Amino acid sequence: MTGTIETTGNISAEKGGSIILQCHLSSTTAQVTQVNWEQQDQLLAICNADLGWHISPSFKDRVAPGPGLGLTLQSLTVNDTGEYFCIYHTYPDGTYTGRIFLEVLE
Amino acid sequence: HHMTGTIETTGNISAEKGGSIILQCHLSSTTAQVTQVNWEQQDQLLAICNADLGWHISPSFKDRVAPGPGLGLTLQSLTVNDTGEYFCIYHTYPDGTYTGRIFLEVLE
Ligand SMILES: [Cl-]
Ligand SMILES: [Cl-]
Ligand SMILES: [Cl-]
Ligand SMILES: [Cl-]
């Protein structure tokens, strides 16, 4: 498994503000078939290569796809503090996972 | 005021020496055409993505800065001297300028 996934790391944003969760896979030519964005174990949205973005109903109002394979979380609350993952499904390499840790300051 | 556009950022970053970070901004809620984004430290120019001419990284950075993702940058090999304010300045028409701020803190 040759590729590496880079993320935005440890980031803070203000309550009621927004945040771009971003990841970038590199060092591989495998096709990214889909990307899942997760708040801990809780799916936020998927971005499938053929069918584009699909958002969890529970987050539909406060999520905007992108930029790119990134995701934008809106109307942050203190409960949005924690870890987020970007799961890349690739062929043939398989799964690459990234982590981002967000602090929502009050 | 009553200016329509909004800039979202990848947030205020805490990182360690030697590390790598993605800086990125996004402009929403406006029809204006974006012709160019300037990325610049506290007042020094890091990079420019022009919509005709493409990317151009400042010479004193080409080694540590890479274009993307999107209209963002990937900044490599952090020193403590990279601590400070970073700006994504959007140049649009007709609205003119829209500006995003990212504070980068680089720890021991
Ligand atoms: Cl898939
Ligand atoms: Cl899945
Ligand atoms: Cl579809
Ligand atoms: Cl992008």
Swiss-Prot record, chain B:
<comment type="subunit">
    <text>Homodimer in cis; binds with high affinity to PVR, forming a heterotetrameric assembly of two TIGIT and two PVR molecules. Binds with lower affinity to NECTIN2 and NECTIN3. Interacts with GRB2. Interacts with NECTIN4.</text>
</comment>
<protein>
    <recommendedName>
        <fullName>T-cell immunoreceptor with Ig and ITIM domains</fullName>
    </recommendedName>
</protein>
<feature type="region of interest" description="Homodimerization">
    <location>
        <begin position="12"/>
        <end position="22"/>
    </location>
</feature>
<feature type="glycosylation site" description="N-linked (GlcNAc...) asparagine">
    <location>
        <position position="12"/>
    </location>
</feature>
<feature type="domain" description="Ig-like V-type">
    <location>
        <begin position="3"/>
        <end position="104"/>
    </location>
</feature>
<feature type="topological domain" description="Extracellular">
    <location>
        <begin position="3"/>
        <end position="108"/>
    </location>
</feature>
<feature type="disulfide bond">
    <location>
        <begin position="25"/>
        <end position="88"/>
    </location>
</feature>
<comment type="function">
    <text>Inhibitory receptor that plays a role in the modulation of immune responses. Suppresses T-cell activation by promoting the generation of mature immunoregulatory dendritic cells. Upon binding to its ligands PVR/CD155 or NECTIN2/CD112, which are expressed on antigen-presenting cells, sends inhibitory signals to the T-cell or NK cell. Mechanistically, interaction with ligand leads to phosphorylation of the cytoplasmic tail by Src family tyrosine kinases such as FYN or LCK, allowing subsequent binding to adapter GRB2 and SHIP1/INPP5D. In turn, inhibits PI3K and MAPK signaling cascades.</text>
</comment>
<feature type="glycosylation site" description="N-linked (GlcNAc...) asparagine">
    <location>
        <position position="81"/>
    </location>
</feature>
